[PDB]
Write a protein that binds this ligand. Structure first.
Ligand code: MVL
Ligand code: BR
Ligand code: BR
Ligand code: BR
Ligand code: BR
Ligand code: BR
Ligand code: BR
Ligand code: BR
Ligand code: BR
Ligand code: BR
Ligand code: CL
Ligand code: CL
Ligand code: CL
Ligand code: CL
Length: 835
């Protein structure tokens, strides 16, 4: 790209527990915990009872040192900057006897001029990480109250005083690992003349005919002379130049602001997953001085995203309009992929997005108790067509709002807004998670004096209704901001449900049946969820076999909600026979979470346009644990992920049965209307025999982006109560010429009420390496089958599906670990779980 040289400061690091004077190799980027693990100085934090055994680390200070060589020639570059992309958290950075920086914000990158401090030959970098605990003890002691951050698993809730990942202090699905270290990359850049400080591609307008852009550059010129330069912007697509623009300047010492207009005629639009291609242009900005001294590029998607949040007859709408078209949101809430962030590899990020794209998602919420994710994450969003709802990193508690804290947050907000604002995927900012809800409804007013309660309320506005929205207005002015999710709606207050987004925790915390999701509807569901134990191979990764009960102390260990086990059983008993064995119980819990949650995903799509989106809680896990996730820590899809994929299908046949009657809806998120369609249904018993005749509804239309009822029949006089216990409804949708475009299966009774016949799923297996093709067969219905393998991270073409009486079913299992010579397979189904 340009004449600069970058040195990656990523080898030869050592670390030491302060005071010990003992030093050992470290891996950077990394964490103090991981460095210790690598030297068997801590046990596997995720195993067994090890949480309590690793806590001591957070009471210690930790130092990091590296040496590097700089040549005479490098020292004669005009400028040299040391960039820290992340320091967790209170870090005194020393280079060659100079204190360059007192870092105090995990979420901030720092760029430091170092030429004048560097020496020819060897150079010594030394970082002192103050314990974030010991650092904030005195701050907590000055405060005279304890903030109500219940997810902070310590008597003193110190999390709130630090700009550090909230979940690192513990969460209701997470381990407490209050770590430190150089958590993103360290780079030393040697350069001439200037660097591009920021390159913002600002979209001014977009029509089918023309995209107008403003290319906004901040150049930091490091020499004392005035430098004539030419600024060049090349717009390209797939390696071919689309437009090129050019601007003569004379760069002054310090910051220069340069703006160059560019246009793209007949622009190829970036579209979300399901609606077309996630087209990305390449925008390259160069500073040319006679040599290209500086260059920076962004991949740019050309699209409009408008969040429509307006008063209406139903209350206040909350929806996303994309490229002019109201887009029903289908997705999940995302949390950190690990307790130790630098352990999340490029491959792990790629697989997560594959999992989202494959489940037909078009949106993800990066929830406020994690981090502002790394550049890769948003790059993957961009190229997978997934819209991104970005919370600022505040969750579930009120926070300080003193001048100095607000200054720190302002830096963090400016840094990440500029970092993220060029991404096609970025759709909106949200000030926090559930803080206004908490302040209003979680009983804080009986916990604090009236004066401190008032200070919390005034402090709320300072941060979330003044500082954050005004910063977004300044630096990202065409992006929506909302102060909180949920902004008004509260799950115990039906009158508030028509106003904006909902976290419906009536299911789970309120003990409400899954069927309540058909009647308790939001304008937009930004959270709802249900826990499940992960499958046995994940349990085995943290527990010995003597530990495989629900309430072993092990298992308790890996259940951070406190309530969760009894809720699971309470809900399971409503719909299923509770199995006697721990492993059968784990299996039925996976089925339960998949079935109840997908009934909600279905209600929300069915009730469009009243409801315009659904993001379940939660996509993923940070470690081996019992949680609300659809994918466990090892990347195994639970039933819920397969069920999310089905419920998010572009076209879906949705049968819904209430008050002894059946409706069938056809739901489409396609951009085109389907015409001359036939819905075909037939009642089949568990032995495979059709009851009565096929039912045909011909001449159906399925308009773009609609949910519509095409069929209703009462059960009474159609099927007897015994038929209902003994048969299912198969439903297929076909075009004019009889091509199948969709299919569903419907059961008339709760699973515990079904007269399931004893049966064996037999299978044939054809195994090559990387691969296992299974052909399954059962003469009778096998209900909710789980094809279970011991192979961590094995991917399946399908799983957690009903194998229909007599119907062959092909399933492909893939894994890099499958060898050309036989994969262990155990097939479970509902009837086996009880006598
Ligand atoms: O309890 C599970 C999850 C939390 O992990 C997370 O804070 C989320 O915002 C939420 N709201 C209600 C419950 N939940
Ligand atoms: Br410099
Ligand atoms: Br600099
Ligand atoms: Br200027
Ligand atoms: Br990174
Ligand atoms: Br108080
Ligand atoms: Br606001
Ligand atoms: Br137990
Ligand atoms: Br019913
Ligand atoms: Br069902
Ligand atoms: Cl261990
Ligand atoms: Cl940046
Ligand atoms: Cl139903
Ligand atoms: Cl059986």
């Amino acid at each position: 790209n340009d004449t600069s040289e970058v040195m990656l400061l990523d080898t030869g690091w050592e670390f030491s527990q302060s005071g010990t004077e003992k030093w050992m190799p470290a891996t950077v980027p990394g964490t103090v915990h991981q460095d210790l693990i690598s030297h068997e100085l801590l046990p596997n934090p995720f195993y067994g009872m090890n949480e309590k055994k690793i806590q001591w680390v957070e009471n210690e200070d930790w130092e990091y040192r590296t040496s590097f060589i700089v040549s005479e020639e490098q020292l004669n570059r005009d400028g040299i900057q040391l960039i820290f992309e992340g320091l967790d958290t209170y870090a005194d950075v020393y280079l060659n006897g100079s204190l360059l920086l007192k870092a105090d914000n995990m979420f901030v990158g720092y760029t430091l001029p170092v030429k004048s401090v560097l020496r020819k030959g060897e150079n010594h970098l030394y970082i002192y990480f103050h314990s974030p605990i010991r650092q904030t003890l005195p701050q907590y002691a000055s405060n005279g109250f304890n903030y109500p951050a219940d997810n902070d698993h310590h008597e003193k809730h110190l999390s709130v005083f630090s700009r550090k990942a909230p979940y690192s202090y513990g969460w209701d699905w997470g381990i407490r690992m209050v770590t430190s270290g150089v958590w993103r990359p360290v780079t030393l850049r040697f350069y001439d003349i200037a660097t591009i400080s920021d390159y913002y591609v600002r979209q001014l307008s977009l029509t089918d005919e023309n995209a107008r852009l403003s290319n906004e550059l901040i150049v930091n010129q490091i020499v004392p002379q005035k430098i004539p330069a030419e600024v060049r912007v090349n717009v390209s697509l797939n390696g071919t130049t689309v437009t090129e623009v050019k601007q003569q300047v004379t760069l002054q010492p310090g910051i220069n602001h340069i703006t160059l207009p560019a246009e793209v005629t007949n622009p190829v639009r970036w579209m979300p997953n399901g609606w077309g291609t996630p087209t990305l242009y390449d925008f390259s900005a160069q500073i040319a001085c006679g040599r290209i001294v500086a260059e920076q590029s962004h991949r740019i998607g050309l699209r409009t995203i408008r969040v429509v949040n307006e008063k209406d007859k139903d209350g206040e709408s909350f929806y996303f309009e994309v490229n002019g078209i109201p887009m029903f949101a289908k997705g999940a809430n995302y949390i950190p992929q690990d307790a130790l962030l630098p352990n999340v590899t490029t491959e792990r990020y790629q697989t997560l997005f594959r999992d989202m794209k494959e489940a037909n998602m078009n949106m993800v919420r990066i929830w406020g108790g994690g981090t502002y994710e790394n550049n890769l994450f948003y790059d993957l969003a961009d190229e997978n067509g997934i819209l991104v709802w970005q919370d600022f990193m505040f969750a579930c508690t009120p926070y300080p709002s003193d001048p100095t804290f607000l200054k720190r947050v302002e830096a963090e907000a400016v840094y990440n807004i500029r970092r993220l604002r060029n991404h096609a995927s970025l759709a909106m900012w949200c000030g926090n998670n559930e803080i206004l809800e908490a302040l209003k409804y979680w009983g804080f007013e009986k916990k604090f004096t009236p004066e401190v309660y008032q200070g919390l309320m005034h402090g709320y506005d300072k941060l979330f209704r003044e500082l954050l929205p005004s910063t977004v207005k300044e630096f990202d002015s065409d992006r929506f901001y909302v102060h909180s999710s949920p902004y008004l709606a509260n799950w115990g207050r039906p009158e508030s449900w028509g106003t904006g987004d909902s976290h419906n925790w009536g299911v789970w915390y309120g003990k409400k049946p899954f069927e309540s999701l058909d009647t308790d509807l939001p304008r937009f569901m930004s959270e709802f969820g249900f826990q499940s134990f992960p499958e046995m191979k994940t349990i085995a990764a943290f527990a010995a076999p003597e530990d495989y009960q629900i309430e072993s102390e092990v298992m308790n260990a890996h259940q951070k909600s406190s309530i969760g086990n009894s809720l699971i059983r309470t809900y399971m008993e409503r719909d299923y026979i509770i199995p006697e064995s721990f492993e059968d119980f784990v299996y039925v819990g996976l089925v339960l979470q998949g079935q109840g949650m997908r009934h909600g995903l279905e209600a929300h799509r069915r009730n469009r346009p009243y409801c315009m989106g659904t993001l379940y809680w939660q996509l993923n896990d940070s470690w081996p644990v019992v949680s609300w996730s659809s994918i466990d820590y090892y990347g195994n899809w639970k039933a819920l992920h397969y069920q999310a994929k089905r419920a998010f299908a572009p076209v879906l046949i949705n049968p819904i049965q209430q008050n002894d009657s059946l409706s069938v809806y056809l739901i489409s998120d396609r951009l085109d209307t389907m015409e001359q369609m036939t819905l075909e249904m037939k009642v089949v018993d568990f032995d495979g025999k059709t009851l009565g005749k096929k039912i045909q509804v011909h001449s159906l239309e399925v308009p773009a982006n609609t949910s519509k009822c095409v069929y209703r029949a009462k059960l009474d006089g159609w099927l007897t109560p015994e038929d209902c216990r003994r048969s299912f409804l198969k439903l297929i949708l076909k075009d004019k010429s009889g091509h199948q475009v969709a299919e569903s299966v419907h059961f008339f009774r709760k699973t515990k009420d079904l007269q399931l016949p004893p049966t064996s799923v037999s299978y044939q297996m054809k195994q090559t390496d990387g691969k296992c093709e299974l052909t399954l067969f059962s003469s009778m219905l096998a209900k909710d089958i789980f094809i279970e393998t011991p192979l961590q991270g094995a991917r399946y073409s399908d799983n957690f599906f009903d194998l229909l009486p007599g119907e062959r079913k092909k399933v492909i299992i893939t894994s890099p670990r499958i060898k050309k010579g036989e994969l262990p397979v155990n097939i479970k189904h509902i009837r086996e779980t009880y006598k």
